[PDB]
Write an enzyme that holds these catalytic residues in place. Structure first.
Site, PDB file in Angstrom:
ATOM      1  N   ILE A 146      22.560  31.614  25.017  1.00 50.52           N
ATOM      2  CA  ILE A 146      22.494  33.078  25.086  1.00 50.52           C
ATOM      3  C   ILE A 146      21.050  33.602  25.119  1.00 50.52           C
ATOM      4  O   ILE A 146      20.818  34.811  25.169  1.00 50.52           O
ATOM      5  CB  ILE A 146      23.248  33.739  23.899  1.00 50.52           C
ATOM      6  CG1 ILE A 146      22.716  33.235  22.550  1.00 50.52           C
ATOM      7  CG2 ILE A 146      24.744  33.483  24.013  1.00 50.52           C
ATOM      8  CD1 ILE A 146      23.232  34.010  21.354  1.00 50.52           C
TER       9      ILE A 146
ATOM     10  N   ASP B  49       6.620  43.939  17.064  1.00 47.73           N
ATOM     11  CA  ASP B  49       7.143  43.585  18.380  1.00 47.73           C
ATOM     12  C   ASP B  49       8.461  44.288  18.682  1.00 47.73           C
ATOM     13  O   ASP B  49       9.375  43.712  19.273  1.00 47.73           O
ATOM     14  CB  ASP B  49       7.289  42.062  18.491  1.00 47.73           C
ATOM     15  CG  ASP B  49       7.338  41.575  19.938  1.00 47.73           C
ATOM     16  OD1 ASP B  49       6.867  42.296  20.848  1.00 47.73           O
ATOM     17  OD2 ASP B  49       7.853  40.457  20.161  1.00 47.73           O
TER      18      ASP B  49
ATOM     19  N   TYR C 272       9.354  28.482  21.772  1.00 48.53           N
ATOM     20  CA  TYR C 272       9.552  27.300  20.918  1.00 48.53           C
ATOM     21  C   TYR C 272      10.976  26.732  20.982  1.00 48.53           C
ATOM     22  O   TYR C 272      11.226  25.614  20.509  1.00 48.53           O
ATOM     23  CB  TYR C 272       9.128  27.601  19.472  1.00 48.53           C
ATOM     24  CG  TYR C 272       7.630  27.490  19.296  1.00 48.53           C
ATOM     25  CD1 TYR C 272       7.010  26.240  19.287  1.00 48.53           C
ATOM     26  CD2 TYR C 272       6.827  28.626  19.173  1.00 48.53           C
ATOM     27  CE1 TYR C 272       5.633  26.116  19.144  1.00 48.53           C
ATOM     28  CE2 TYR C 272       5.446  28.515  19.025  1.00 48.53           C
ATOM     29  CZ  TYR C 272       4.856  27.251  19.013  1.00 48.53           C
ATOM     30  OH  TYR C 272       3.492  27.109  18.867  1.00 48.53           O
TER      31      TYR C 272
ATOM     32  N   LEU D  48      25.332  38.897  17.151  1.00 44.25           N
ATOM     33  CA  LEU D  48      25.562  40.222  17.715  1.00 44.25           C
ATOM     34  C   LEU D  48      25.885  40.076  19.201  1.00 44.25           C
ATOM     35  O   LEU D  48      25.827  38.974  19.735  1.00 44.25           O
ATOM     36  CB  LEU D  48      24.362  41.137  17.464  1.00 44.25           C
ATOM     37  CG  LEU D  48      24.318  41.655  16.025  1.00 44.25           C
ATOM     38  CD1 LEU D  48      23.480  40.740  15.136  1.00 44.25           C
ATOM     39  CD2 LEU D  48      23.803  43.082  15.981  1.00 44.25           C
TER      40      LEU D  48
ATOM     41  N   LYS E 138      19.239  29.382  16.608  1.00 48.34           N
ATOM     42  CA  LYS E 138      17.947  29.241  17.274  1.00 48.34           C
ATOM     43  C   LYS E 138      17.412  27.836  17.047  1.00 48.34           C
ATOM     44  O   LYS E 138      17.047  27.484  15.935  1.00 48.34           O
ATOM     45  CB  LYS E 138      16.948  30.285  16.770  1.00 48.34           C
ATOM     46  CG  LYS E 138      15.558  30.147  17.390  1.00 48.34           C
ATOM     47  CD  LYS E 138      14.962  31.483  17.807  1.00 48.34           C
ATOM     48  CE  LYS E 138      14.408  32.268  16.643  1.00 48.34           C
ATOM     49  NZ  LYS E 138      13.640  33.446  17.138  1.00 48.34           N
TER      50      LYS E 138
END
Ligand SMILES: CN1CCN(c2cccc3nc(-c4n[nH]c5cc(-c6ccc(N)cc6)ccc45)[nH]c23)CC1
Lengths: 256, 297, 255, 255
Positions: free
Chosen positions: B10, B127, B15, B83, B33
């Site tokens: 997704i 960010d 990294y 989400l 992740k």
């Protein structure tokens, strides 16, 4: 607006980041002296690589917490510190020294793999809780209550706060906020003859009475600094960047 | 990792990748992740270190929850709540209609609550852009991607490098200020707010100077009266053209009198710029609701 | 050392607390579903002749697990199975083998799933399995009976077990307090007596301090015959429990 | 005349009272059996699209009949059938024919039995069928809504209907008081508001005076999903009642 909330939050988190005060007794092979040597060496490494003062403070906090739950042999104490400094640099520095640099400063006593494995181990042992409050952060917060600012006072406060890092006895048993408060008052008194201001009393809730025990110890550390076996911090703070504040003579008494 | 079933990719990163995944034992749907660990050269990336350590202090309904960290041999996985999509794709999907104003108000309200919580916990996000903001079918929006985030118990030093894509970058940063402040997050959110309302980036600069000038053309070239200190800042030039501030009624036509007032306070030049907490008390939110979006999945 | 142990149990019950409001933060499951699960665990205990303590431990494990982990309705029973398996290993002299636990689930789950869930629950609970329970506090209170009465003991245990079924309101009371209310209410129902002075001194709990829990427990007791879950009533109409679930509750506590 | 009627209803509700403790004096039947009967009467009402008032009247008739007549468990449903038939004749514009009532009992009873029971209930109640109900008092209270809210009205009616199921504790409250508690609790749940001053003046009931009934009603509301009888919850998840039975109850009333 938010510097009240942030101070409040830092006061909450410093009670949680506490290492065990008496951990060095329960530690078979290493001592306070050996810790003193390690921290003094970390000051040099910070000067060599132009690292922020916050990085130093964080690294020491990481070392004390690691040693609070892990037995280390004297020949591995430096590997713990190296990994701690590495992690603190990654957290705090804009761009940290590469790993090869940290292997460098140890005079090839340890390998790249060892340092990287110790980094993993310290992250596990600390459970990635790296954002610890420090004396540095509380001093910074207190400096905003200077009427008006005085760089000599700020440098001396920072010098005393940095000296507190070297001696586990007695400074492990004081909160960063308290050590900060004592360093600020002592520097303020030495440079300008003034005392812990009423604005900071309201902000922190600490009186000059409540700071007295820590003040007592810090004053004694300040008087004995020239005789201490570890000298890297005195040397650092006789630079012009710090207005040569490590040459300022301490008062012989505090008049409390 | 044995209890996680990889469903699909997704998200791709620097990294590593983000996968949608399912806990096989509990049925919990998650975002994983993956971080590949180069165990010769670098160790755990600074992004992961900051992201993990700061995010686990930040439990709030408008900040994406870090559920777990599976740290092993040569892989690091961060487990997050899942989400449904980011705000950028939702904006693109809503081009022929706009996001309705009540949903915009809701989203800004929630983003400010998330931001206020970050700031009260001495965390700078740094960010905030639409693709780092995640939404669900129930009408929630949350802050994500804390890779660049920083603790500011000690003031955070500005970079030469790496940062906030140009369009959401605050004027002080462009003018080369030495330290970040919380104002930079509020600036970005102002830009995102305007973008939702107008359906276009407020300041789509092609470069740093072009970015500055687009801001000057809309808001006026700042002087010492508007922003005490501007002219002494590193990247300020006296040769800068002097543009006039234009009406907000023409910059953000669909906004009412209260909306314009909030946006102007969020885009204030002097980092006097409204705080997240103060913005939450603004009369703009005195009828906020929690509508559900039409997510085209 | 019976004082040292009560003191220590009082310390540990404050630390083993699950989150009182966890079910709200839980997307797919409800209190009713939990009620169904716990009622089923009572049956399993009767089927395999498991100690009452094993039941109480298993429910403690389930609440703590669900306090930090989202679970889908189709996996709620796998959590309970693994919890009951772990509680049996901790508390039983010889627990049922894993195959037994796979079979009471009617092959809805595999041996591997159950063993993997066992590992996950141990990880999530950090091997902290020796939790204080209502059962343990009741047992300690029973030593302050002047003199012992098995009908009171059975009814106290019955009421304490009923508290396991309904997260609302019993998640917000300490086991020591639920135990105290169950003891008084059983004592009052069978013999007409009240929370004794010896237990007031031992626990520091007055009849005033037990009142909120007592009023809930009394209300649960009155409505027990109407509850959708009935395995506990059925269990306690047995001779081993002197048919205490067929006793009439007091209409008033006169507090 | 709306004042005259409230006044008159308040007079008559004190006279139509059944005996609060009649079920104890009753050898073969229990509160649970009554709960089952009333729940079944709710289904019958849904099946034949009967007014809510008809349900409330029928239950009033059953309680008064059982207050002076011993009935065996196998005849309890015949009493309810005859009561529902009589309530339909009194309240419905066109009631279901007698054959309809014989068929919902699955031919457990005959037409003759049902018609004979109708006669007996009329004799025992002395033709006093125009009893005040929770429904009638709610309807009168709804006229003091500033302004009207159909979600509040539906939830008030839902709570009032739940009170019919459990003889303990609701037999010991007047319909006017149950109505008052149901109105407040629904009003509080939907809009956050409280028992209004206009109704305080009309009824003379304070929020203090409603408190005992309110605490019972709140407790019934919280436990509704766990109740063995579910026909009312099912009925009130319909669109005609705005799915109010799926609304979450308040965790506290803050009284
Ligand atoms: C660029 N976009 C982003 C959104 N992507 C996306 C599409 C569809 C469903 C998606 N679900 C996610 C997601 N759920 N939870 C997350 C947490 C982080 C996270 C990562 C790091 C931190 N620090 C915090 C949260 C990132 C991404 C996600 N992202 C999705 C599509 C591609």
């Amino acid at each position: 607006d938010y510097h009240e909330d942030i101070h409040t939050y830092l006061r909450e988190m410093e009670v949680k980041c506490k290492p065990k005060v008496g951990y060095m007794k329960k530690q078979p092979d290493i001592t306070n002296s050996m810790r003193a040597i390690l921290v003094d060496w970390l000051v040099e490494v910070g000067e060599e690589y132009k690292l922020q003062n916050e990085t130093l403070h964080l690294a020491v906090n990481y070392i004390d917490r690691f040693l609070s739950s892990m037995s280390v042999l004297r020949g591995k104490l430096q590997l713990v510190g190296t990994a701690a400094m590495l992690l603190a640099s990654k957290f705090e520095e804009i761009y940290p020294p590469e790993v090869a640099e940290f292997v460098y400063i140890t005079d090839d006593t340890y390998t790249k793999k060892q340092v990287l494995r110790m980094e993993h181990l310290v992250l596990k042992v600390l459970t990635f809780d790296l954002a610890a409050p420090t004396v540095n952060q509380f001093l910074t917060q207190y400096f905003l209550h200077q009427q008006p600012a005085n760089c000599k006072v700020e440098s001396l406060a920072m010098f005393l706060g940095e000296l507190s890092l070297i001696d586990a006895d007695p400074y492990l048993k004081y909160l960063p906020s308290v050590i900060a408060g004592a360093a600020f008052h002592l520097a303020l008194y030495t440079v300008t003859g003034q005392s812990w201001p009423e604005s900071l009393i309201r902000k922190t809730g600490y009186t000059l009475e409540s700071l007295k025990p820590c003040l007592m110890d810090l004053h004694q550390t300040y008087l004995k600094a020239p005789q201490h076996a570890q000298q890297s911090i005195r040397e650092k703070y006789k630079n012009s960047k710090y207005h040569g504040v490590s040459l300022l003579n301490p008062p012989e008494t505090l008049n409390l | 990792m044995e209890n996680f079933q990889k469903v699909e990719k997704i998200g791709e990163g620097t990294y590593g990748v983000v996968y949608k995944a399912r806990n096989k034992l509990t049925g919990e749907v998650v975002a994983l992740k993956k971080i590949r660990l180069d165990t010769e050269t670098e160790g755990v990336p600074s992004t992961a270190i900051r992201e993990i350590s700061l995010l686990k202090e930040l439990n709030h309904p408008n900040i994406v929850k870090l559920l777990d960290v599976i740290h092993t041999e040569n892989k690091l996985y961060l487990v997050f709540e899942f989400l449904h999509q980011d705000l950028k794709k939702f904006m693109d999907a809503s081009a022929l209609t706009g996001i309705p104003l009540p949903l915009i108000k809701s989203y800004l309200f929630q983003l400010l609550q998330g931001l206020a919580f970050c700031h009260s916990h001495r965390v700078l996000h740094r960010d905030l852009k639409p693709q780092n903001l995640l939404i669900n079918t129930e009408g929630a929006i949350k802050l994500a991607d804390f890779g660049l985030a920083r603790a500011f118990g000690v003031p955070v030093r500005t970079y030469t490098h790496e940062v906030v894509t140009l369009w959401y970058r605050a004027p002080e940063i462009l003018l080369g200020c030495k330290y970040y402040s919380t104002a930079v997050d509020i600036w970005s959110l102002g830009c995102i707010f305007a973008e939702m309302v107008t359906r276009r980036a407020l300041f789509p600069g092609d470069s740093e100077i072009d970015q500055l000038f687009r801001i000057f053309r809309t808001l006026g070239t700042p002087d010492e009266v508007v922003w005490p200190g501007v002219t002494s800042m590193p990247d300020y030039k006296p040769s800068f053209p002097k543009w006039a501030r234009q009406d907000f009624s023409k910059v953000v036509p669909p906004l009412d009198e209260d909306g314009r007032s909030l946006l102007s306070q969020m885009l204030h030049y002097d980092p006097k710029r409204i705080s997240a907490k103060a913005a939450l008390a603004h009369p703009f939110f005195q009828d906020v609701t929690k509508p559900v979006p039409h997510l085209r999945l």
